[PDB]
Amino acid sequence: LKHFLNTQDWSRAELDALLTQAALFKRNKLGSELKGKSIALVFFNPSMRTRTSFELGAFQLGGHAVVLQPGKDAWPIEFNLGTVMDGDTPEHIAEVARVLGRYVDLIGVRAFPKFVDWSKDREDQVLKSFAKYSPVPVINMETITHPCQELAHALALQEHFGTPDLRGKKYVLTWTYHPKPLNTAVANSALTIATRMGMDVTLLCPTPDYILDERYMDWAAQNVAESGGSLQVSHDIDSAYAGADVVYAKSWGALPFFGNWEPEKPIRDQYQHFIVDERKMALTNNGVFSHCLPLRRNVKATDAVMDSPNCIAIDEAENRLHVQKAIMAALV
Amino acid sequence: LKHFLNTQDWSRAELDALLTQAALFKRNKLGSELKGKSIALVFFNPSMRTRTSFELGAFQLGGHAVVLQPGKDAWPIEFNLGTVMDGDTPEHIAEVARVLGRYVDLIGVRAFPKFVDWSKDREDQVLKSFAKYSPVPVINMETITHPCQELAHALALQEHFGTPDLRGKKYVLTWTYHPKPLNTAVANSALTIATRMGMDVTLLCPTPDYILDERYMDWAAQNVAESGGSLQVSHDIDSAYAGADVVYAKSWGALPFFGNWEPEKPIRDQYQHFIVDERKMALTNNGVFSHCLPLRRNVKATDAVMDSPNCIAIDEAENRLHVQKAIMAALV
Amino acid sequence: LKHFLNTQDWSRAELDALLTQAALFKRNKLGSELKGKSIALVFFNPSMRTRTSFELGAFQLGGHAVVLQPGKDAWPIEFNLGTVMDGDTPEHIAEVARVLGRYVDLIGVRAFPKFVDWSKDREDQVLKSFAKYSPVPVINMETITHPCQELAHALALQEHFGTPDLRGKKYVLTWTYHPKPLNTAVANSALTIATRMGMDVTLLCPTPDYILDERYMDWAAQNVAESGGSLQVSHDIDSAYAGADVVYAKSWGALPFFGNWEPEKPIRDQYQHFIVDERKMALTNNGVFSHCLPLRRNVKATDAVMDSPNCIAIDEAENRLHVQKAIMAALV
Numbered sequence: 001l002k003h004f005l006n007t008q009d010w011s012r013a014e015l016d017a018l019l020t021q022a023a024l025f026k027r028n029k030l031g032s033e034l035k036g037k038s039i040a041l042v043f044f045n046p047s048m049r050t051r052t053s054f055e056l057g058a059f060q061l062g063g064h065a066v067v068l069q070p071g072k073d074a075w076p077i078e079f080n081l082g083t084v085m086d087g088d089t090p091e092h093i094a095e096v097a098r099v100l101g102r103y104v105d106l107i108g109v110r111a112f113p114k115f116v117d118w119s120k121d122r123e124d125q126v127l128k129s130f131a132k133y134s135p136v137p138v139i140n141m142e143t144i145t146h147p148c149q150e151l152a153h154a155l156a157l158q159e160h161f162g163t164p165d166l167r168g169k170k171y172v173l174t175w176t177y178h179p180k181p182l183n184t185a186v187a188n189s190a191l192t193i194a195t196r197m198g199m200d201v202t203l204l205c206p207t208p209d210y211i212l213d214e215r216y217m218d219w220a221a222q223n224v225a226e227s228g229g230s231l232q233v234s235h236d237i238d239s240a241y242a243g244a245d246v247v248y249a250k251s252w253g254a255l256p257f258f259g260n261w262e263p264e265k266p267i268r269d270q271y272q273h274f275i276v277d278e279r280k281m282a283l284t285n286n287g288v289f290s291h292c293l294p295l296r297r298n299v300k301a302t303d304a305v306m307d308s309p310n311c312i313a314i315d316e317a318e319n320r321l322h323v324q325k326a327i328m329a330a331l332v
Numbered sequence: 333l334k335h336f337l338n339t340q341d342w343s344r345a346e347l348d349a350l351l352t353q354a355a356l357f358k359r360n361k362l363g364s365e366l367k368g369k370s371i372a373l374v375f376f377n378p379s380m381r382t383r384t385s386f387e388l389g390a391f392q393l394g395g396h397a398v399v400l401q402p403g404k405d406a407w408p409i410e411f412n413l414g415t416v417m418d419g420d421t422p423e424h425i426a427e428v429a430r431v432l433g434r435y436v437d438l439i440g441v442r443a444f445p446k447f448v449d450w451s452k453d454r455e456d457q458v459l460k461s462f463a464k465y466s467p468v469p470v471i472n473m474e475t476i477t478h479p480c481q482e483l484a485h486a487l488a489l490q491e492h493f494g495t496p497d498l499r500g501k502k503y504v505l506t507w508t509y510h511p512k513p514l515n516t517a518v519a520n521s522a523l524t525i526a527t528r529m530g531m532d533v534t535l536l537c538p539t540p541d542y543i544l545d546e547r548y549m550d551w552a553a554q555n556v557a558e559s560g561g562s563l564q565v566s567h568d569i570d571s572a573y574a575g576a577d578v579v580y581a582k583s584w585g586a587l588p589f590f591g592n593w594e595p596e597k598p599i600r601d602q603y604q605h606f607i608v609d610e611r612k613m614a615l616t617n618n619g620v621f622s623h624c625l626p627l628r629r630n631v632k633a634t635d636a637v638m639d640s641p642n643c644i645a646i647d648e649a650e651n652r653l654h655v656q657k658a659i660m661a662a663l664v
Numbered sequence: 665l666k667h668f669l670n671t672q673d674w675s676r677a678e679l680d681a682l683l684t685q686a687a688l689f690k691r692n693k694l695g696s697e698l699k700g701k702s703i704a705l706v707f708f709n710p711s712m713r714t715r716t717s718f719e720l721g722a723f724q725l726g727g728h729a730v731v732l733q734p735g736k737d738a739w740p741i742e743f744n745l746g747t748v749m750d751g752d753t754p755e756h757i758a759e760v761a762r763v764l765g766r767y768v769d770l771i772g773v774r775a776f777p778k779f780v781d782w783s784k785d786r787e788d789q790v791l792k793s794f795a796k797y798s799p800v801p802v803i804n805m806e807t808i809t810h811p812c813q814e815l816a817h818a819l820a821l822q823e824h825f826g827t828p829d830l831r832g833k834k835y836v837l838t839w840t841y842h843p844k845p846l847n848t849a850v851a852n853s854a855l856t857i858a859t860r861m862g863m864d865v866t867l868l869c870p871t872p873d874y875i876l877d878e879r880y881m882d883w884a885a886q887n888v889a890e891s892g893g894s895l896q897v898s899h900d901i902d903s904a905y906a907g908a909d910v911v912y913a914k915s916w917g918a919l920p921f922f923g924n925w926e927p928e929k930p931i932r933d934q935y936q937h938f939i940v941d942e943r944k945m946a947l948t949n950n951g952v953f954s955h956c957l958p959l960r961r962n963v964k965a966t967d968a969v970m971d972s973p974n975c976i977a978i979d980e981a982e983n984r985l986h987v988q989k990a991i992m993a994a995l996v
C-alpha cells in the first residue's frame with residue numbers, strides 16, 4: 001500500500017505528477033475524486049491551515065473528513081509494544097488504526113515531537129505506527145517532516161518563477177528567532193524539497209549546534225547529487241542572503257539541547273538579529289520570502305517584510321489545499 | 333465588499349429583503365445557494381445555537397462549514413499592530429484572515445468582550461480586524477452586538493403578529509438578574525432592531541448605571557426618528573410592563589464597572605426581583621416573551637413563564653437558522 | 665414518537681429488521697435515507713468509535729452530523745427541575761432539546777454515570793430528559809446501557825457463525841481487570857442482548873459484589889424465559905470458559921462501592937488474573953473473543969489474544985457503522 005509519509009519516498013516523476021495535478025485542481029476545485037469517500041484527520045497538536053485545507057479539500061472532492069483529537073474527544077492512544085496498559089492511554093494504535101481502517105478511506109496524522117529526547121522523537125513512532133497497522137493509505141500532516149508543506153511551498157515557487165524547473169536558483173533556508181525552541185520538521189522538509197528541486201541551497205543558522213539532524217543533511221546531499229543543485233551550511237547572514245532567489249525562514253530548537261533547554265535559552269536569545277527584515281532582503285536578488293506559518297511578526301520577520309509584495313506566504317498557504325487534494329486523489 | 337457586521341450598516345430595504353428571503357428559506361430549507369461553497373466559523377467563546385444553526389444552514393444550502401476555535405484547535409490569534417509577537421499568540425489576524433480568504437467563501441466570528449476595560453471592548457477589535465484583512469464577506473456571530481439574533485428575533489415577532497409592520501407595538505427590553513455580569517451585546521442589538529422596526533421601546537433596567545453604551549442609545553434615537561417609534565429608559569417595573577406587546581429579557585454587567593466588578597456584585601444582587609415572572613407578564617397586553625438563550629430558569633425567568641404559550645424563545649432560536657441562510661446567500 | 669434508548673424497548677421482530685437492514689447497508693454503504701437530514705451528536709464523555717461511525721453514517725446516507733460537547737463548545741446543560749439555575753449550568757435541557765428539535769432530525773446522546781451515587785446514575789436522567797423534551801427521535805450513544813454496541817456485537821456474532829440463530833451457544837460475559845472502576849453500561853447491554861438472542865449466558869465476575877444491577881439481571885431472566893436460553897452467575901474462571909462459543913470481556917466498578925471507591929481499589933487489584941489470556945481461551949470451544957473497545961492491552965486481554973484470529977473486536981467496531989445507519993434510517 002502506497003502512503004504519503006515523506007516526499008523522499010516518492011520518485012521525481014510521481015512528485016511531479018502530484019504538483020501538476022495540484023495545479024489542475026487549482027483551476028477546477030470541485031470534483032468527485034473522493035465521492036462517498038472520507039478521511040480521518042488525527043491531531044495530537046494544534047492546527048489552523050492543515051485542519052482547514054484538508055477538511056475543505058475532502059469536501060470539494062465529494063468526500064468527508066472526520067477530525068479527531070486524541071485526548072480532547074477521541075481516547076488517548078498508546079504506541080509502545082508489549083506494555084501493560086495501566087497508564088493514561090485507554091487503547092492501542094494497533095486497534096485504533098484497524099478500526100479507522102473500517103470507517104475511513106484515508107488517515108492523516110499530526111504529531112509533533114515531545115522535545116524531551118530527540119533520540120525518541122526522531123523515530124517518527126506515531127507516523128510509522130499508523131502506517132504499519134492501517135489497512136488504508138496514511139498521510140503525514142506533520143511530525144518530524146512536513147511533506148505537505150513541501151509541495152505547497154514548491155508549487156508556490158514554480159508559480160512565482162513561472163516555471164517548474166527551479167534549478168540554478170539560490171535557495172536560503174534561514175533559522176530565525178523565537179522565544180522558545182520549536183520543531184525542526186518544516187526545516188527538515190524545506191531542506192529536502194529544495195535540494196530535490198535541484199536549487200543552490202544554503203542552510204543559514206546561528207551555530208553548528210543548530211544544524212539539522214544528519215538524516216536530512218544526508219537526504220539533501222543525495223538530492224543535490226541527483227538534481228545537480230548544491231548544499232551548504234553558513235553561519236554568516238550577509239554571505240547567505242547575497243543574491244538569493246528564495247528565502248525560507250523557520251525557527252527551531254537546537255537538537256543537541258533536547259531535554260535540556262535551560263542553557264539553550266541564553267544561546268538563542270543572542271541571535272535575535274536573525275529576524276528576516278528589509279536589510280537582509282535587500283541583499284537578495286529581489287528574492288522571494290516565505291514561511292509555513294503560523295508566523296510571529298517582529299520576531300521571525302518584520303511587518304515590512306510580511307507585507308512586502310515579495311512575500312508569498314499566503315500563496316504557499318493556499319496551495320496546501322490544492323496539493324493535498326492531489327495527494328488524497330492519488331492515494332485512493 | 334459587503335459584510336454583515338451590524339443591521340445598522342444595512343438599509344431598511346436590504347434588511348427587509350433578508351427577512352423575506354429568510355421566510356422563503358423557512359418554507360424551502362434545502363437549496364443550492366451555497367453549492368461547493370464553505371464558511372469558516374471562528375469561535376473565541378462557547379456556543380450551541382449559533383454554531384449549530386450555521387453549520388446546518390451551510391449544509392442545507394450545499395456548502396460546508398469549518399468550525400475553528402483559536403486556542404483549542406486552531407492557533408491563538410494576535411490583533412494588535414506593530415507588536416513584538418513573543419507572547420502567547422503564534423500568528424496575526426492579518427495572516428489568518430488572508431489565509432482563510434484562500435480557503436473559504438465566508439468568515440463568521442464570535443468574540444465576547446474581555447470585561448476588563450469597556451473602552452477596549454467597545455472597539456470591536458476582533459470583528460473589525462477580520463473585516464479589514466479578509467478578502468471575503470465577514471459575519472458577526474456575536475461580539476458587542478448580535479445582529480443575527482436581531483433578525484431571528486424580528487422575524488419571530490412579525491410571525492407572531494402575522495405582519496411585517498411592527499410599528500405601534502410596545503416593546504419592553506428588560507434587564508434581568510444573573511449571579512454574574514454579562515455581555516451587553518444582545519441588549520445593544522435588541523434596542524437597535526426594536527427601534528429600527530419602529531416600536532415603542534422601553535429600556536427597563538435597575539439603575540442609570542445599567543443603561544447601555546451611548547453608541548446604541550444614539551443608534552436607537554436615530555432609529556426612532558426614522559421609523560416613527562419611540563425610546564424611553566425606565567427604572568420602574570410596573571410602569572414598563574404595563575400594556576406591553578413584547579418583553580425581551582437579557583442580563584448584563586453595568587458598563588461603568590468593567591474591570592471593577594467587586595462592588596457590582598452587591599448592586600445586582602439587590603435586584604433579583606427583576607426576574608420575569610407571571611405577575612409582570614400579567615401586567616402586559618397579553619404580550620409575548622423571549623430570550624436569546626442560553627437562559628437560566630428561576631433566575632432570569634420563572635419556569636411558569638418559559639413554559640407559557642406566550643414564550644416564543646424556541647421560535648426565535650429556530651429562525652436563527654433561516655435568517656443566517658439568508659445572510660450567507662446574500663453575501664456570496 | 666419512537667426512540668432508540670434500549671434494545672429492550674424493541675420487539676424481536678423490529679430488532680431483527682434492524683440487523684438485516686444493517687447487513688444490507690454493509691453491502692450498499694452509500695444511500696439517501698438521510699438526504700438533507702441531520703443529527704445532533706451530544707457528547708458528555710470521550711469517544712472515538714461512536715463519534716466517527718455516526719458522523720460517517722450520516723454522511724454516507726446524504727445527511728450531516730453536528731457534533732456537540734457541552735462544556736467544550738456548547739453550553740453546559742442543567743437536568744434537574746424546579747431549580748434556581750445560578751450555578752455552572754447556563755441553560756436547561758428543556759430548552760436545549762426543543763431548540764435542537766428545530767434544527768436536527770435526530771439527537772444522539774452520550775453521558776456516562778458520575779460514579780458518586782449509583783442511585784442517581786441508574787436513573788438515566790440525561791437520556792430520559794432528552795427523550796422527554798425532544799420533538800425528534802433520540803438515540804442512546806451510551807449512558808448506563810450501550811444498545812448500539814449490542815447490535816454491532818450481535819451482528820458480528822451472527823456473521824461469525826454464519827447464522828442469525830445464535831440459540832444454544834455458550835456465551836461468557838466476563839469481568840476483567842482495570843486500574844480503575846468503570847461504567848457497567850457495556851456489560852448491562854451485553855447481558856441484555858446475549859439473553860435476548862437466547863444463548864447460554866454466564867456472568868463471570870470476581871465476587872457477588874460485582875454482579876450487575878438487578879434491573880438488567882431481571883431483563884436477562886425475562887429474555888431467557890422468552891428465547892429459551894439461560895442465565896447464570898459464576899465466580900470460577902475455568903468452569904465458565906469451559907466449552908464457550910463466545911467470550912465478551914468488560915471491566916466495571918462494583919456497584920455497591922459507588923461514592924466509596926477507596927476500599928474497592930484493594931479488592932479489584934486482587935483479581936488481575938481475570939485478564940483474558942490464551943490459557944482461558946484454550947478452555948473454550950475454539951470460542952470467539954471480543955471487546956467494545958477502547959481496550960487496554962496486557963490488562964484486560966493479552967496481546968496474544970487480541971492478535972488472535974479468534975478476536976472479532978475489529979469487526980464488531982466496524983458494524984457499529986452499519987448498525988447505526990439502520991437505526992437512523994428507521995427513526996426518520
Ligand SMILES: CCC[C@H](NC(=O)CCC(=O)O)C(=O)O
Pocket residue numbers: 089090846847848849850956957958960
Ligand atoms: C465503549 C466503552 C466506553 C467506556 N470506557 C471507558 O470509560 C474506558 C476508559 C479507560 O479505560 O481509561 C465504558 O467503560 O463504558
Ligand SMILES: CCC[C@H](NC(=O)CCC(=O)O)C(=O)O
Pocket residue numbers: 182183184185186292293294296421422
Ligand atoms: C507549521 C509549523 C507548526 C509548528 N509551529 C509551532 O509549533 C509554533 C508555535 C508557536 O510559535 O507558539 C512547527 O514548529 O512546526
Ligand SMILES: CCC[C@H](NC(=O)CCC(=O)O)C(=O)O
Pocket residue numbers: 514515516517518624625626628753754
Ligand atoms: C446568546 C448570549 C450569549 C452570552 N451569554 C452568556 O455568556 C451566558 C453565560 C452564563 O449565563 O453563564 C451573552 O451574554 O451574550
